[PDB]
Each structure stands twice: as structure tokens, then as C-alpha cells.
Design an enzyme around this catalytic site. Structure first.
Site, PDB file in Angstrom:
ATOM      1  CB  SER A  85      -1.125  -0.118   1.042  1.00 63.01           C
ATOM      2  OG  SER A  85      -1.753   1.166   1.184  1.00 63.01           O
ATOM      3  CG  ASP A 134      -7.370  -3.163  -1.421  1.00 60.47           C
ATOM      4  OD1 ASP A 134      -7.802  -1.926  -0.810  1.00 60.47           O
ATOM      5  OD2 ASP A 134      -5.897  -3.458  -1.661  1.00 60.47           O
ATOM      6  CG  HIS A 148      -6.168  -2.699   2.015  1.00 62.87           C
ATOM      7  ND1 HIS A 148      -4.948  -2.186   0.773  1.00 62.87           N
ATOM      8  CD2 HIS A 148      -4.830  -1.904   3.109  1.00 62.87           C
ATOM      9  CE1 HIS A 148      -3.997  -1.722   1.358  1.00 62.87           C
ATOM     10  NE2 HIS A 148      -4.002  -1.226   2.304  1.00 62.87           N
TER      11      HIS A 148
END
Ligand SMILES: COc1ccc(N2CCN(C(=O)c3cc4c(s3)-c3ccccc3S(=O)(=O)C4)CC2)cc1
Length: 223
Positions: free
Chosen positions: A114, A168, A202
């Protein structure tokens, strides 16, 4: 004066390669060091630096571990240009340190999750030394409008593994897809591998960790 706070997985054999992996917003490098140790190669060192604690605008200016400030979640949202570049400079010092101490740049892989993945893409694409590649997980390209122009000439040789969870909610899979197009605008489309995982949100997943292992084994062979 270079001072690095990190969790490092050492090689069981003399280290001839290095992976510098950057964690996501609010984390430390601990969990990702443990994860990379489960897929470690004997001659490869895995450096997981701990992000500094800064106020994060988007989280009501709360102090937390972050590679740079965050303001919005859409691709057109303002980004922390000064913060992104300063953090990229700190990572580029880590690259040059490994180089100064016997690890060739074409034996160094940058990576992250991320926000950390996002910093590793910016830093590797603008690095003046030809790096081995990048392992970019569930992320986006910071300052994407500056690319491909902003990328260094040395970015041509990079091998990129970019992974994403199809479900996600934090970094939508379409943002990952748009980032992959931008990466193929710098690196040959064949040297960019964009892998998406159904039913993954995620996070990481055993298939992604296996892809990372396979990518690094082929990219960083012994000796
Ligand atoms: C070439 O294609 C693209 C496509 C999209 C983008 N965007 C992505 C969104 N963005 C962001 O700044 C942020 C992303 C995240 C933020 S804020 C965040 C906030 C709160 C908690 C957690 C997080 S997060 O998990 O780190 C994810 C601007 C750029 C750039 C290029």
C-alpha cells in the site's frame, strides 16, 4: 549521518542481494519481516525499515507511522510532493549504503505494501542506479502525472511484480490497473507483471507470497 531503524531478515549464507520492503500506513516493519522470512532465499537480506511517526491530515492530523502525509483517496487528490520526494531520498541513501558495502544495484529489489509499495514505485523509477526490480503490493504510483517523463533513464532495466486484491476497498483494484499502465509507460510491458487475486481485500494472501518467492528466485539467483 545515516541512521536506520528496521527489522532485518539476514541471509543464512553471505548476502549477495538485498530486498528493501516498506510497510503500509500505521504499521512497523515487524510483520512484513516475519512474512518475508517465511519465503526467504539463503543469500538474500530483507530490510524492513520502520516508518517515522508524523501527523496524517486524512486521519484528523493524528500522529502515526507514515512514509508521507495523506489527504485524499481519489487519483486526482492532492499528494504530499515534498514528503514523497524526501522519503524517496531517505530510501535512495539506503540503496547507496548497500552499494557502498558490496551489493550491486542490479542485485537490489525495492518493495512494499500500500503506502510503502507506493513509495517503492516512486523511488525505484527515479533512482539513478539500475536496480533489479520492484515488488509492489496493493498500491499506486505517487505523483503519477509526472510519469513517464520523471522516471530516470536507469528505470528501463527494471523487472516489476505488481500484485493486487480484486476486492480491495482501500486501494481499488482499478487504481492498481491504472498504475500498471503507467509503469508499462516506463518499463517494457513484458517486464511488468500485474497479478490480481479474486476474493482478496486490502491484504496479502498465500498465492501472492508464492508469486513474490517465484519472482525473487528468478530475479535474484544464487551468486
Ligand atoms: C496511476 O494510478 C493512480 C491511481 C490512484 C492514485 N491515488 C490513490 C489514492 N491516493 C492517496 O493518496 C491515498 C491512498 C491510500 C490512502 S490516501 C489511505 C488513506 C487512509 C487510510 C489508508 C490509506 S492507504 O491504504 O494508504 C491508501 C492518491 C493517489 C494514484 C495513481
Amino acid at each position: 549521518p545515516l541512521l536506520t531503524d528496521a527489522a532485518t531478515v539476514s541471509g543464512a549464507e553471505r548476502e549477495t542481494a538485498a530486498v528493501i520492503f516498506l510497510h503500509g500506513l500505521g504499521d512497523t516493519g515487524h510483520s512484513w519481516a516475519d512474512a518475508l522470512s517465511t519465503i526467504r532465499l539463503p543469500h538474500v537480506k530483507y530490510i524492513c525499515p520502520h516508518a517515522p511517526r508524523i501527523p496524517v491530515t486524512l486521519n484528523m492530523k493524528m500522529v502515526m507511522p507514515s512514509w508521507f502525509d495523506l489527504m485524499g483517496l481519489s487519483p486526482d487528490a492532492p499528494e504530499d510532493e515534498a514528503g514523497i520526494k524526501k522519503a524517496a531520498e531517505n530510501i535512495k541513501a539506503l540503496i547507496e549504503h548497500e552499494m557502498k558495502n558490496g551489493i550491486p544495484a542490479n542485485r537490489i529489489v525495492l518493495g512494499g505494501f500500500s503506502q510503502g509499495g507506493a513509495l517503492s514505485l516512486y523511488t525505484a523509477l527515479t533512482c539513478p542506479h539500475p536496480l533489479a526490480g520492484i515488488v509492489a503490493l496493493s498500491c499506486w504510483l505517487p505523483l503519477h502525472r509526472a510519469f513517464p517523463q520523471a522516471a530516470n533513464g536507469s528505470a528501463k532495466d527494471l523487472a516489476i511484480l505488481q500484485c493486487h486484491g480484486e476486492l480491495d476497498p482501500m486501494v481499488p483494484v482499478r487504481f492498481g490497473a491504472l498504475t500498471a499502465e503507467k509503469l508499462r509507460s516506463v518499463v517494457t510491458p513484458a517486464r511488468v507483471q500485474f497479478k490480481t487475486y479474486p476474493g482478496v481485500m486490502h491484504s496479502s494472501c498465500p498465492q501472492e507470497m508464492a508469486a513474490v518467492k517465484e519472482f525473487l528466485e528468478k530475479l535474484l539467483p544464487p551468486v
